[PDB]
Amino acid sequence: KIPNFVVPGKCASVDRNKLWAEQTPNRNSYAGVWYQFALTNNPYQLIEKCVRNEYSFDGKQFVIKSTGIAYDGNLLKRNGKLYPNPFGEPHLSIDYENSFAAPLVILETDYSNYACLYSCIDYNFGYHSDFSFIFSRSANLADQYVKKCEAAFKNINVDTTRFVKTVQGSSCPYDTQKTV
Amino acid sequence: KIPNFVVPGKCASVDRNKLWAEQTPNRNSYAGVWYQFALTNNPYQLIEKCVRNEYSFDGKQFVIKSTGIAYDGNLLKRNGKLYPNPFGEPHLSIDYENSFAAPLVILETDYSNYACLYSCIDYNFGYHSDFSFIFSRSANLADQYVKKCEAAFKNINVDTTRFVKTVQGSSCPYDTQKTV
């Protein structure tokens, strides 16, 4: 029970089929660059600051190039993929090199400003861990969009006070990050 | 103050390239039924007792039907897949319906008696989590083979005192399990 990302109870039901209906035809619009505006405590994100995720869609998957400042303060690039769950479940799997793959539900997105992302894993002792993100198309994110994400996470009983803001903005060397 | 499967330092090098080469020509021999003899503390495994994993190989991946008795005392079947890591890394991904996918290394096997399996993940805070397993072609497994896996795990710095025996034997309803 001790870490704040280990939470009583089964992973939430999040109405995946409605979401998959909404999103499948708009995969093309989800490509491009997304900045990680905020996230809940995540022991698997190696990139601490200036997190910049670049998605290319190929018709079957997305290829991701994630860059930013690692926790030791150095530049870091991570290779990712985002593809339909291999068992035919109505969600995607997010898979990164030298890591593992997890379910990734887009709870809500307008494609042009924000996306609200959610992953959950169940334990055999009746608890779960989940990991949530707020993505923006820019370094900052208007309040109105931040509040949309807050509502979508509260709708599935994710405690939104768990979100922490990620360093973004003028202190980030994005232009270097894009060179890889 | 932390779980015994969260260990300081990084995942050790386990020479995957050598294993992968030895193992790609023998996929058909790895198919069939394997019984879980023992494992290290694993908060993801939903089957507690009588763990029986039936593998089928189709020429590109294994399809797995994993059955046994769940923590609640009911029979349980889980559908799983084991396929090459999607980035081209020299290990397999073990994937289960309604779960995540994780790297899985076959540290050692003779195909006809035993297999020693290993999964490890690095965190962002200077620790790793690893998950080890001893598999047998039968419900019991002779000391001769157990010792082989013990040596393999010790060779990669895993503390073998972490292994726990799984209930197997004439008490398990394997013929029911095989039927779903």
Curated annotation (Swiss-Prot), chains A, B:
It is found in: Secreted, Extracellular space. The keyword Nucleotide-binding does not apply. Transmembrane segments: none annotated. Found in the carapace. GO terms for molecular function: pigment binding. GO terms for cellular component: cytoplasm; extracellular region. InterPro entries: Calycin, Invtbrt_color, Lipocalin_ApoD, Lipocln_cytosolic_FA-bd_dom. Its main location: secreted. Keywords: Chromophore, Disulfide bond, Pigment, Secreted, Transport. One of its GO terms (biological process) is response to reactive oxygen species. Disulfide bonds join 11-120, 50-172, 116-149. Oligomer; Can form dimers (beta-crustacyanin); or complexes of 16 subunits (alpha-crustacyanin). There are five types of subunits: A1, A2, A3, C1 and C2. PANTHER family: APOLIPOPROTEIN D. Binds the carotenoid astaxanthin (AXT) which provides the blue coloration to the carapace of the lobster. Belongs to the calycin superfamily. Lipocalin family. This is Crustacyanin-A1 subunit. It comes from Homarus gammarus.
